[PDB]
């Protein structure tokens, strides 16, 4: 009976970087997914594996929320099979995913004049990473031939480069916060479901 | 027009200090890293430090507790503060643009864009 906490994650005042991507866990509760499908406040919300407007109808087990920020024109990136420096080395998606990526426009709350560093995404790894696996590994990157032993010089940089979010930056340099929808599709017992 | 020019170098006498400056032309400093390196007479490219975009300053360990990168990103100049100026610090000081991007080819410097170079001379 007890309503699921979408205005926590959502409506959150910090949100968390790509690279250190946050998760939260929906479980045993209602979840009314038509105010957040009817709601003009996303300006993308695409679903996979599931009609929008069937969330309400079906009962989910191991709901998951994951939000981050990125920058504007790297929200094509949160999707199956993509690639790019968030698909490969800060967030990936697997193929069979099932579930709602959901993304909308945070310039008023995530750039500051100055420019805002608060968020980080990871520049450089040595792999792609595995869906759903979170790197936080701050280790001095080696992007030449001499190796770096955990001190940086010539072609050895740290991992990770902050966003610079002015107000100033057209839309695709603009900060936009993803929160990203996992459910399993009725084969356990759920505790997730609609009204 | 991309960019670079030092200025400060000169004599200076040991022990003491002295500021070094890289105004930046054609682009600003709020999006890429920007190092500092020195070439000794005898010697090859040293590598002293480098500015990130988020202010994150990283040295050369066996050279730390004498240099300092700051900012003024007012005026779009990056500043190398010595202190403590010995005899092999009498050397040729660049300032050159991190490439994070895209590489061409094999770089041993991993440098998109120097600075002319600004010379330093510690002696009597």
């Known amino acids: 009976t007890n309503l699921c906490p979408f205005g926590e994650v959502f409506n959150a005042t910090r949100f968390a970087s790509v690279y250190a991507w946050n998760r939260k866990r929906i479980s045993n509760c209602v979840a009314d997914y038509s105010v957040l499908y009817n709601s003009a406040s996303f300006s993308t919300f695409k679903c996979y594996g599931v009609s929008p407007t069937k969330l309400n109808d079906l009962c989910f087990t191991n709901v998951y929320a994951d939000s981050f920020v990125i920058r504007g024109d790297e929200v094509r990136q949160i999707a199956p099979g993509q690639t790019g420096k968030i698909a490969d080395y800060n967030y990936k998606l697997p193929d069979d995913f099932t579930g709602c990526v959901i993304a909308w426009n945070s310039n008023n709350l995530d750039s500051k004049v100055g420019g805002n560093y608060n968020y980080l995404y990871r520049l450089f790894r040595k792999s792609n990473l595995k869906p759903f696996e979170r790197d936080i590994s701050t280790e001095i990157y080696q992007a030449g031939s001499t190796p770096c032993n955990g001190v940086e010089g010539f072609n050895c940089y740290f991992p990770l480069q902050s966003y610079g979010f002015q107000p100033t930056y057209g839309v695709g340099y603009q900060p936009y916060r993803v929160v990203v929808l996992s459910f399993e599709l009725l084969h356990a017992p759920a505790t997730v479901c609609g009204p | 027009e991309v960019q670079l020019v030092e200025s400060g170098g000169g004599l200076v006498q040991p022990g003491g200090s002295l500021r070094l400056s890289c105004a930046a032309s054609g682009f600003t400093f709020d999006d890429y890293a920007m190092s500092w390196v020195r070439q000794a007479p005898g010697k090859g490219l040293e590598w002293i430090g480098r500015?990130?975009?988020?202010?994150?300053?990283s040295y050369n360990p066996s050279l730390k507790s004498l240099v300092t990168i700051s900012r003024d990103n007012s005026k779009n100049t990056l500043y190398l503060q010595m202190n403590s100026l010995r005899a092999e610090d009498t050397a040729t000081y660049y300032c050159?643009?991190?490439?994070?991007?895209?590489?061409?080819?094999?770089?041993?410097?991993?440098?998109?864009?120097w600075g002319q170079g600004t010379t330093v001379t510690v002696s009597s």
């Open positions: 500015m990130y975009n988020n202010g994150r300053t």
């Open positions: 050159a643009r991190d490439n994070l991007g895209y590489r061409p080819s094999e770089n041993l410097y991993g440098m998109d864009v």
